[PDB]
Amino acid sequence: MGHHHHHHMSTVARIQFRLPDGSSFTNQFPSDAPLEEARQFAAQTVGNTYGNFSLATMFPRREFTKEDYKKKLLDLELAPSASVVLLPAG
Secondary structure, three states: OOOOOOOOOOOEEEEEEEOOOOOEEEEEEEOOOEOHHHHHHHHHHHOOOOOOOOEEEOOOOOOOOHHHHHOEOHHHOOOOOEEEEEOOOO
16 A cells, blocks of 8 residues: 554454444454454353354455354454454244
8 A cells, every 4th residue: 555564552452242232242362362262252251142153354255164263363364453343043
């Protein structure tokens, strides 16, 4: 685009966990911390409600795989902010 200044403020990522309810909750996830943390954190809240929900990013909409969870957050460019999409099954 036209810049040459990256990495200076911080080294963490921000994700917004949404849901069918309409609202969403924002959390703090480092650029290295596992992505599953956001998944388990949301699931731990309700315990058992969504069931078989699917998590994905807003754009460019590429879906999430088993590797996306095991790996870090910034691995898929989540910093400094990102959005998710819940696809519950019931």
